Amino acid sequence: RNIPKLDAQRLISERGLPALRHVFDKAKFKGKGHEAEDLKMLIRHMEHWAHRLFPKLQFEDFIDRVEYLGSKKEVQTCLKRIRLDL
Amino acid sequence: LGQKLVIWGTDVNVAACKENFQRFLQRFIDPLPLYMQRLGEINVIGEPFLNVNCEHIKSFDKNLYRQLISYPQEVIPTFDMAVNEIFFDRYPDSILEHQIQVRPFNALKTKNMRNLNPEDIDQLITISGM
Amino acid sequence: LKDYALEKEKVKKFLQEFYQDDELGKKQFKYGNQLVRLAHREQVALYVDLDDVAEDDPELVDSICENARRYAKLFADAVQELLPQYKEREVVNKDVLDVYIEHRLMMEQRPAELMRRFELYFQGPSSNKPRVIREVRADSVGKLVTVRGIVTRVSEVKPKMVVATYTCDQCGAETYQPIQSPTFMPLIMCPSQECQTNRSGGRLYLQTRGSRFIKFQEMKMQEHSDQVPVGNIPRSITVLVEGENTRIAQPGDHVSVTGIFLPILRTGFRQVVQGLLSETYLEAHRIVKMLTREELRQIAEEDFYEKLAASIAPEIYGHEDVKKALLLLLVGGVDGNINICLMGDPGVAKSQLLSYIDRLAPRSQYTTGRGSSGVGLTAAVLRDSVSGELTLEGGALVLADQGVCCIDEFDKMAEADRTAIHEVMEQQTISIAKAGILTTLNARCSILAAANPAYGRYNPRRSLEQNIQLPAALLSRFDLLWLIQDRPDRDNDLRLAQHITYVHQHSRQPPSQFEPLDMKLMRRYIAMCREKQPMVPESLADYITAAYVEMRREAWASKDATYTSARTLLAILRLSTALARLRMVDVVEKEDVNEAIRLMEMSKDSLL
């Protein structure tokens, strides 16, 4: 059966942050004075990444869960690794 | 993003269809700028629909007519978006109870009731009857 | 019983290697040449003939006939596996399902029944003699049978789902559901692994654009009445028709259907209640329905008008006047009907004209006005209460729509039917309520009426309405009112009796020493002569006026101003234009007007 979870080890560092590193390589922001549409583009890309990661939840529920997951060993180790090299 | 859309299993681009219908509205003139007169009539009368002749669509652009006949469920909402975009690009502060409906029609019947087939499903047809 | 894996290869060998000679002894592979067309989508229906299969394996023919549906599926699988061998061109996509399949194939490069756009049918072997419906017994269940019958009810062509195509909203994948049963369960939630493992909750939307439909048509066949046993009701069978077999047959058509006799599948509570019993249908596989130079040189004879009139009723003497009038009934006036009424005693050769004209007319009916227990002059509703659907039947006036309707005992017509005759003669249609909702039927037909006096023999002492007891509102619609008299007359009676006795003892018409035109030649002639649409010249208006007024004034001066009106002139013009059509000249002339006037005058002379 394998009921999935948005936890620290199934997908957040497997289809999650490693892909999120690449999501915005081809983004198209235009800077000062256009913060509204830049934020709309950002929110759409983040929402799409979150949906493909864990499709069971809505976007704000996903955010409220992943913010809790930010305290876990695997998540912060991957965060520091992504900060450093790869 | 609208430019990424294609009708399902169809290879027709929704944005290109919208642009083709917009230039049709802008440039067709000869039933003897035709449809901007109809837009002005809508603007003053207050009826949210536009009647359009499929023969005019065909003579202006055969491919657009083929797309309309084959895939009306997507193409006709695309035409609704096109006509509303033109109408509210003009007449900027006119108020309508609803968005305009494009109502394509053939002047005469394309088919009859006895010859309707499963090949015609989800296809735009014109028939005469009582 | 047999190994169907080996049987499929046998079928492939037959389809690949069979050959027949069509022209100049040249050899052709009749099924390979059709597999090429099937591969190119030039042809959709493949009728494989078990008479051809019998030429190299009668055992395969016996297996097919005894287990037909299994072998139909095997032949379809074999043909689908063979078409790639015969591919040599690209298809022009013309169905939207072709376009969808094209993009499906491209995305797969980047559902066998779905990719299968053809249909295969067994054309029955001649060793299987055709049965009647009553002989299609339970032993023939699941077996290929040929059945003859009358088509009596045909549904509209409906879309029958074969392969339902769905799309998922979450994962963007297509799902396919082949449908064998008459009913099926729609798919709700996506069964794809991507949705299932993630518990995505993505659901399925049917795409009719991507799904495969087939034309479907139900009909009812009925036994031939002369083939029913003596005391019995005619039996009936449902035939389910699909694909290219649809629209072949219509109601009233005599048909022979080769098909598979199967029991009906049931769902819900019907299988609970019915138990071992089952209703049956025939799965249709093949439906079969049961001058210019040479005769123009004959038509050049000046006899041709009287030759046709003589050919309109060779069994009757002296009535060539009436036969000419009935010729103009069949020809009709310029646009246009011509209506005729015949009055006479019961038991006279006045029904003979109705019978002959009905037989000769291409579209026709011959009913009686005496209140039929069936479908009357007008339409009627049938309930079909195995299912309950109301359906509409035409009747005499509707079934004779673009032709001629013969009505015997026209006087005994009830008022409910007389009003319908008024509707037909005024506006050429009838109207009926099917379920409280009213539908309108065409009846653009010429009426040949035959009445009898209300009581006793005809009596010229009385007026015509007194004789027939039918109002002038009916009688004035007609163009010619004829009295078909009958008096004892020794030599004519002797000849009639000799004629009828010859007919009895030899079952054939006696030699009359005249050669009438054959019925098919007469039909081709009338079509050729009614194809014309003449016009009356304006210079003849004065002569038409003169003829009309002098006929009118003779009625004033000599017969107490008996009824005439402007429709008399209109009837004269219609008769003269019918004569012009008959003569195949596109201009009406003095002779046409004279003969129309003469015809009307002699009909009134027969009355008087």
Add this chain to the structure above:
DNA sequence: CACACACTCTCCAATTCTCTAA
């Protein structure tokens, strides 16, 4: 009869509470 709906109960495991070490 029997094949779909409608409803309840139980178990399983996933999340949160409590106490401890980094």
Add this chain to the structure above:
DNA sequence: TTAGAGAATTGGAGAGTGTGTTTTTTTTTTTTT
């Protein structure tokens, strides 16, 4: 001050139980024939 290992509580998957279903004719009577 953060967070992680062990114990207890709550969410919901799914196993099990019970319910519901597939125009026609003869005769009378009042009013109108």
